[PDB]
Short mmCIF file of C-alpha atoms in Angstrom, two decimals:
data_model
loop_
_atom_site.label_atom_id
_atom_site.label_comp_id
_atom_site.label_asym_id
_atom_site.label_seq_id
_atom_site.Cartn_x
_atom_site.Cartn_y
_atom_site.Cartn_z
CA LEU A 1100 0.09 0.21 0.07
CA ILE A 1101 0.78 3.53 -0.47
CA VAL A 1102 -1.15 5.91 1.73
CA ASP A 1103 0.13 9.29 0.51
CA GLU A 1104 -0.74 10.14 -3.07
CA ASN A 1105 2.29 12.69 -3.49
CA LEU A 1106 4.69 9.66 -2.84
CA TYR A 1107 2.70 7.25 -5.38
CA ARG A 1108 2.74 10.27 -7.86
CA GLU A 1109 6.66 10.71 -7.30
CA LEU A 1110 7.42 6.84 -7.67
CA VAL A 1111 5.02 6.73 -11.13
CA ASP A 1112 6.83 9.99 -12.44
CA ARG A 1113 10.41 8.84 -11.58
CA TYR A 1114 10.14 5.01 -11.66
CA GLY A 1115 6.89 4.12 -13.63
CA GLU A 1116 8.27 1.00 -15.50
CA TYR A 1117 8.36 -2.20 -13.56
CA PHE A 1118 5.42 -1.85 -11.30
CA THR A 1119 1.56 -1.00 -12.25
CA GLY A 1120 -0.84 0.05 -9.70
CA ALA A 1121 -4.28 1.51 -9.46
CA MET A 1122 -6.93 1.96 -6.73
CA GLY A 1123 -10.14 -0.02 -7.75
CA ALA A 1124 -11.69 -3.18 -8.36
CA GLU A 1125 -10.30 -4.33 -11.95
CA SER A 1126 -6.97 -4.16 -10.15
CA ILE A 1127 -8.05 -7.42 -7.76
CA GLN A 1128 -9.45 -9.07 -11.19
CA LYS A 1129 -6.23 -8.94 -12.80
CA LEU A 1130 -4.29 -10.12 -9.63
CA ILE A 1131 -6.59 -13.42 -9.10
CA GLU A 1132 -6.57 -14.04 -12.66
CA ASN A 1133 -2.71 -13.67 -13.04
CA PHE A 1134 -2.55 -15.71 -9.66
CA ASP A 1135 -2.43 -19.61 -9.21
CA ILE A 1136 -3.98 -21.81 -7.04
CA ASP A 1137 -2.06 -25.30 -7.11
CA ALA A 1138 1.42 -23.71 -6.02
CA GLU A 1139 -0.09 -21.88 -3.11
CA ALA A 1140 -1.94 -24.88 -2.30
CA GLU A 1141 1.26 -26.87 -2.20
CA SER A 1142 3.19 -24.42 -0.18
CA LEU A 1143 0.24 -24.27 2.59
CA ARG A 1144 0.35 -28.23 2.44
CA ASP A 1145 4.14 -28.08 3.11
CA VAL A 1146 3.73 -25.60 5.99
CA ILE A 1147 1.10 -27.57 7.61
CA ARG A 1148 3.50 -30.61 7.46
CA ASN A 1149 5.43 -28.49 9.85
CA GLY A 1150 4.35 -27.15 13.36
CA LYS A 1151 4.21 -23.95 14.85
CA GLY A 1152 0.50 -23.70 15.63
CA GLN A 1153 0.18 -20.11 15.60
CA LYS A 1154 0.58 -19.82 11.82
CA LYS A 1155 -0.24 -23.52 11.26
CA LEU A 1156 -4.03 -22.49 12.06
CA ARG A 1157 -4.00 -19.64 9.60
CA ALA A 1158 -2.31 -21.98 7.21
CA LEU A 1159 -5.05 -24.78 7.63
CA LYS A 1160 -8.01 -21.87 7.14
CA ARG A 1161 -6.37 -20.57 4.00
CA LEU A 1162 -5.54 -24.10 2.46
CA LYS A 1163 -9.16 -25.10 3.23
CA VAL A 1164 -10.48 -22.13 1.06
CA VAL A 1165 -7.92 -22.74 -1.64
CA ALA A 1166 -8.55 -26.70 -1.82
CA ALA A 1167 -12.32 -25.65 -1.93
CA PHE A 1168 -11.61 -23.65 -4.81
CA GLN A 1169 -9.32 -26.14 -6.51
CA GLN A 1170 -11.81 -28.77 -5.84
CA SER A 1171 -14.84 -26.76 -7.23
CA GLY A 1172 -13.59 -26.95 -11.16
CA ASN A 1173 -14.34 -23.23 -11.06
CA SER A 1174 -12.26 -20.14 -10.94
CA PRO A 1175 -12.17 -17.21 -8.57
CA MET A 1176 -12.80 -14.58 -11.41
CA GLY A 1177 -16.70 -14.99 -10.49
CA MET A 1178 -16.12 -12.82 -7.45
CA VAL A 1179 -15.92 -9.63 -9.77
CA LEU A 1180 -19.18 -8.90 -11.53
CA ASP A 1181 -19.66 -7.09 -15.02
CA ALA A 1182 -23.14 -7.52 -15.95
CA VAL A 1183 -25.80 -7.74 -12.91
CA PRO A 1184 -29.16 -8.96 -13.90
CA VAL A 1185 -32.59 -8.04 -12.85
CA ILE A 1186 -35.47 -9.99 -11.54
CA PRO A 1187 -38.82 -10.04 -13.54
CA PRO A 1188 -41.54 -7.38 -13.22
CA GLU A 1189 -44.16 -9.26 -11.28
CA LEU A 1190 -41.62 -10.19 -8.73
CA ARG A 1191 -41.31 -6.57 -8.00
CA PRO A 1192 -44.86 -5.47 -8.64
CA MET A 1193 -45.80 -2.10 -9.97
CA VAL A 1194 -48.79 -0.54 -7.74
CA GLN A 1195 -50.83 1.97 -9.24
CA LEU A 1196 -52.69 3.45 -6.47
CA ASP A 1197 -55.91 5.81 -6.95
CA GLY A 1198 -53.01 8.47 -7.40
CA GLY A 1199 -50.94 6.05 -9.49
CA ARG A 1200 -48.05 6.40 -6.80
CA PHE A 1201 -45.57 3.69 -6.82
CA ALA A 1202 -45.48 1.84 -3.13
CA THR A 1203 -44.32 -1.74 -3.45
CA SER A 1204 -40.48 -2.86 -2.72
CA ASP A 1205 -38.10 -0.25 -3.74
CA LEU A 1206 -36.21 -2.75 -5.80
CA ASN A 1207 -37.27 -0.23 -8.77
CA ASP A 1208 -35.40 2.60 -7.14
CA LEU A 1209 -32.39 0.47 -6.50
CA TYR A 1210 -32.45 -0.27 -10.02
CA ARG A 1211 -32.75 3.30 -11.15
CA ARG A 1212 -30.01 4.35 -8.95
CA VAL A 1213 -27.93 1.84 -10.37
CA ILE A 1214 -28.89 2.45 -14.05
CA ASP B 736 -38.81 -44.67 26.31
CA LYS B 737 -37.98 -45.23 22.86
CA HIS B 738 -39.58 -41.96 21.72
CA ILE B 739 -36.84 -40.35 23.98
CA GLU B 740 -34.12 -42.83 22.86
CA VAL B 741 -34.60 -41.64 19.33
CA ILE B 742 -34.10 -38.14 20.22
CA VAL B 743 -31.04 -38.61 22.42
CA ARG B 744 -29.26 -40.79 19.88
CA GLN B 745 -29.36 -37.91 17.55
CA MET B 746 -28.29 -35.33 20.29
CA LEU B 747 -25.26 -37.28 21.37
CA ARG B 748 -23.61 -38.06 17.78
CA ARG B 749 -20.76 -35.67 17.79
CA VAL B 750 -17.05 -36.07 18.36
CA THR B 751 -15.04 -32.99 19.04
CA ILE B 752 -11.34 -33.12 18.03
CA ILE B 753 -8.40 -31.48 19.93
CA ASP B 754 -5.87 -31.88 17.20
CA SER B 755 -6.10 -32.36 13.46
CA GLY B 756 -2.55 -33.33 13.12
CA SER B 757 -2.58 -35.42 9.67
CA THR B 758 -6.13 -34.26 9.23
CA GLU B 759 -7.62 -31.32 7.05
CA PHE B 760 -10.36 -30.06 9.39
CA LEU B 761 -9.54 -27.38 11.74
CA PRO B 762 -9.00 -28.67 15.41
CA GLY B 763 -11.85 -28.31 17.83
CA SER B 764 -14.46 -28.69 15.17
CA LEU B 765 -17.61 -31.14 15.41
CA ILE B 766 -17.42 -33.96 13.22
CA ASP B 767 -19.96 -36.83 13.22
CA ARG B 768 -18.61 -40.15 14.84
CA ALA B 769 -18.96 -42.19 11.48
CA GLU B 770 -16.87 -39.57 9.14
CA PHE B 771 -14.59 -39.15 11.74
CA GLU B 772 -13.74 -42.89 12.08
CA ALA B 773 -13.90 -43.32 8.36
CA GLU B 774 -10.95 -40.56 7.99
CA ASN B 775 -9.12 -41.91 10.61
CA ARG B 776 -9.04 -45.41 9.65
CA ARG B 777 -8.21 -44.21 6.14
CA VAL B 778 -5.17 -42.20 7.47
CA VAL B 779 -3.87 -44.97 9.48
CA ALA B 780 -4.20 -47.75 6.69
CA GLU B 781 -1.95 -45.50 4.73
CA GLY B 782 0.55 -44.75 7.61
CA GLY B 783 -0.63 -41.45 8.48
CA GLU B 784 -0.96 -40.92 12.29
CA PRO B 785 -4.58 -40.91 13.63
CA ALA B 786 -6.48 -37.75 14.92
CA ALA B 787 -7.27 -37.44 18.62
CA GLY B 788 -11.16 -36.94 19.14
CA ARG B 789 -13.56 -37.63 21.61
CA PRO B 790 -17.21 -37.84 21.87
CA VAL B 791 -19.39 -34.98 23.15
CA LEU B 792 -23.09 -33.78 23.51
CA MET B 793 -24.79 -30.49 22.74
CA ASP C 116 -4.12 -13.07 2.01
CA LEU C 117 -4.96 -9.47 2.36
CA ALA C 118 -6.24 -8.04 5.47
CA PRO C 119 -9.76 -6.32 5.26
CA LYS C 120 -8.55 -2.78 5.81
CA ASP C 121 -6.19 -3.19 2.69
CA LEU C 122 -8.99 -4.79 0.61
CA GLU C 123 -11.84 -2.48 1.47
CA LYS C 124 -9.57 0.62 1.04
CA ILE C 125 -8.49 -1.03 -2.65
CA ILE C 126 -12.34 -1.35 -3.19
CA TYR C 127 -13.46 1.78 -1.49
CA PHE C 128 -10.93 4.26 -2.91
CA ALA C 129 -8.28 5.65 -0.24
CA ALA C 130 -4.89 4.18 -1.10
CA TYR C 131 -3.16 2.95 -4.42
CA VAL C 132 -1.89 -0.74 -4.45
CA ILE C 133 1.19 -2.20 -6.74
CA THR C 134 -0.67 -5.39 -8.46
CA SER C 135 2.49 -7.11 -10.26
CA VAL C 136 6.09 -6.39 -10.48
CA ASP C 137 8.59 -7.91 -13.04
CA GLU C 138 11.24 -8.14 -10.25
CA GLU C 139 13.68 -10.13 -12.32
CA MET C 140 14.47 -7.26 -14.89
CA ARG C 141 15.08 -4.80 -12.00
CA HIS C 142 17.18 -7.12 -10.28
CA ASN C 143 19.05 -7.53 -13.80
CA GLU C 144 20.19 -3.62 -13.21
CA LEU C 145 19.50 -3.25 -9.58
CA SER C 146 23.34 -2.40 -9.36
CA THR C 147 22.92 0.07 -12.17
CA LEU C 148 19.84 1.54 -10.69
CA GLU C 149 22.22 1.88 -7.45
CA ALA C 150 24.48 3.55 -9.37
CA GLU C 151 22.18 6.14 -11.21
CA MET C 152 20.61 6.38 -7.61
CA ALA C 153 24.38 7.46 -6.07
CA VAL C 154 24.94 9.49 -9.13
CA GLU C 155 21.71 11.60 -8.81
CA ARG C 156 22.21 11.92 -5.07
CA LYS C 157 25.73 13.32 -5.78
CA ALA C 158 23.98 15.70 -8.17
CA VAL C 159 21.60 17.18 -5.46
CA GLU C 160 24.48 17.16 -3.02
CA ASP C 161 26.71 18.97 -5.43
CA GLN C 162 23.83 21.65 -5.82
CA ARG C 163 23.63 21.62 -2.08
CA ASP C 164 27.13 22.14 -1.52
CA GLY C 165 27.06 25.22 -4.03
CA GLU C 166 23.99 26.56 -2.19
CA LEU C 167 25.84 26.14 1.12
CA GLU C 168 29.14 27.57 0.25
CA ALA C 169 27.66 30.67 -1.69
CA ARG C 170 25.39 31.31 1.49
CA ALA C 171 28.49 30.84 3.88
CA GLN C 172 30.34 33.02 1.81
CA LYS C 173 27.71 35.82 1.66
CA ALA D 468 -46.40 -39.03 0.64
CA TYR D 469 -48.89 -38.65 -2.61
CA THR D 470 -51.65 -36.97 -0.60
CA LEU D 471 -49.03 -34.31 0.71
CA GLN D 472 -47.55 -33.79 -2.60
CA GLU D 473 -51.26 -32.93 -3.80
CA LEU D 474 -52.09 -30.67 -1.26
CA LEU D 475 -48.69 -28.89 -1.89
CA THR D 476 -48.43 -29.03 -5.88
CA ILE D 477 -51.87 -29.83 -7.57
CA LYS D 478 -54.32 -27.82 -5.56
CA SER D 479 -52.37 -24.68 -4.42
CA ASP D 480 -49.97 -23.54 -7.20
CA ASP D 481 -49.58 -25.31 -10.39
CA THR D 482 -51.70 -23.69 -12.89
CA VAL D 483 -51.26 -26.37 -15.56
CA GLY D 484 -51.75 -28.83 -13.01
CA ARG D 485 -55.00 -27.31 -11.76
CA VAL D 486 -56.33 -26.82 -15.44
CA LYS D 487 -55.42 -30.55 -16.41
CA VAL D 488 -56.84 -32.12 -13.21
CA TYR D 489 -60.41 -30.33 -13.55
CA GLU D 490 -60.45 -31.33 -17.18
CA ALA D 491 -59.67 -34.74 -16.25
CA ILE D 492 -62.27 -34.88 -13.43
CA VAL D 493 -64.90 -33.60 -15.85
CA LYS D 494 -64.02 -36.34 -18.04
CA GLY D 495 -63.20 -39.96 -16.91
CA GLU D 496 -59.53 -39.96 -17.47
CA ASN D 497 -56.94 -40.45 -14.50
CA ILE D 498 -55.71 -37.62 -12.84
CA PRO D 499 -51.97 -36.69 -14.53
CA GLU D 500 -49.14 -36.24 -12.08
CA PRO D 501 -48.67 -32.95 -10.63
CA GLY D 502 -45.56 -30.90 -12.12
CA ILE D 503 -43.59 -28.11 -10.59
CA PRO D 504 -45.07 -25.68 -7.91
CA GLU D 505 -44.66 -21.95 -8.84
CA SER D 506 -42.87 -21.30 -5.40
CA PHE D 507 -39.90 -23.65 -6.50
CA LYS D 508 -39.77 -21.79 -9.98
CA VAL D 509 -39.93 -18.33 -8.44
CA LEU D 510 -37.42 -19.52 -6.09
CA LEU D 511 -35.05 -20.13 -8.72
CA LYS D 512 -35.67 -17.39 -11.20
CA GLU D 513 -35.17 -15.16 -7.82
CA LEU D 514 -31.86 -16.96 -6.37
CA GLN D 515 -30.38 -16.81 -10.01
CA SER D 516 -30.39 -13.02 -9.78
CA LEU D 517 -27.68 -12.92 -7.07
CA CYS D 518 -25.31 -14.35 -9.45
CA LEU D 519 -25.48 -17.85 -7.86
CA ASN D 520 -26.05 -20.13 -10.87
CA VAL D 521 -28.53 -22.67 -9.56
CA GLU D 522 -28.20 -25.40 -11.92
CA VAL D 523 -30.64 -28.75 -11.65
CA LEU D 524 -28.62 -31.73 -12.50
CA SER D 525 -31.64 -33.79 -13.87
CA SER D 526 -28.75 -36.53 -14.44
#
């Protein structure tokens, strides 16, 4: 991390060659897709083979998550969305009162904000 | 009595585990007796050390 | 393996992050990078010495 | 089991189920087996909206 923007600006102006850094979601997508699961799983298994309970429990939990990912046959890229769906209309009924005002669940308002 | 036995049989059918050792599951996590025994016999049959667990109710 | 603070900062906009780094090509000229670091520090030192000498003489 | 299946599917939710059973009763035909309740299909088409791809695995 780089808390102060001045330091990051100086780094990019002076040494903007090797490291690429952006603040916001796509960065995570690129990092995870470039990242690999099997190697980390093997490293965590090797760590578990040793002792040191303190870090061993964290290794166990992380290995559990990574092994779940590996066994699922899927990829982590599903955690960054690019096209959200919308439920059918009747599931978000439009009610027209005597004055025509909408009064049912605000799902419509939330979709309005997002769009 | 059997109406009560059928309940207490389900109630006390968990095996808390103190150490995982050669097992993936987190120590101190409830595992039913059957699956814990199956994994223990599998790991022992291949030479892996057994997991130390004890029965407990809830 | 990123703390919730860092992850939510990266998602909620407050601090940059270095995603990837080709460490090898920097290592291949880490000594040359050190040399240019030394000579640019020498340049700033030279201007500093000029200013200090001028002001002390004044 | 079958009575519960009827009470939950063929007399409360399934539209085509209701129509077909009424027609069969009006005639002499046997009651066709119930179908998929509207509640379950609504549950699917609602859970699929949270990016959770809910498959069926008929196999």
